[PDB]
């Protein structure tokens, strides 16, 4: 929530924010506040089995939310409904491309560099956005 580009720090402002590593077991853990146990109160000597039933149901709603419905839009999708991008002010994703960056090695050829190599990665790529209709004034930003 920085208010001005001037509230950003050296690195961020010049290179952009940092993003998440590709997903793996250690970089895609369940949200840190994930419940590991759900307590349910009980009268000194008895337990309301009907309440216990509700308790679970309630928990279920809580979990679903924590695990994958943390964003309003996703909760509404949960019900089988939908939301315009104006509903939560989300930028509209118009096109997403992804590709691997490969290249070649350069062979060292002098007395000491003979048998050495330097990797030069150089990948060509196309990123094409199909004719899009702009309903209101604004910006079309493309990032990498």
């Amino acid at each position: 929530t920085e208010a001005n580009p001037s509230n950003l720090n050296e690195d961020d402002a010049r290179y952009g924010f940092r993003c998440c590593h590709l997903k793996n077991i250690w970089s895609a853990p369940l949200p840190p506040e994930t419940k590991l146990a759900e307590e349910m109160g009980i009268e000194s000597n008895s337990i309301d089995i009907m309440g216990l039933q509700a308790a679970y149901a309630q928990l279920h709603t809580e979990q679903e939310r924590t695990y994958f419905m943390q964003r309003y839009r996703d909760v509404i999708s949960s019900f089988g409904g939908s939301t315009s991008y104006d509903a939560d002010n989300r930028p509209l994703l118009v096109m997403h491309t992804d590709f691997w960056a490969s290249g070649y090695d350069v062979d060292g050829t002098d007395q000491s560099s003979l048998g050495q190599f330097s990797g030069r990665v150089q990948q060509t790529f196309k990123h094409s956005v199909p004719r899009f209709f702009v309903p209101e004034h604004g910006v079309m930003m493309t990032l990498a």
Partner: peptide, 24 residues
């Protein structure tokens, strides 16, 4: 030696990562 440079996608199978929502 094309695939050998790029770590697999693990696209086969079901969903593994629940992290609260969509994360690029």
């Amino acid at each position: 030696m094309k695939k050998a440079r790029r770590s697999p996608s693990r696209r086969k199978g079901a969903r593994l990562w629940y992290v609260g929502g969509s994360q690029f």
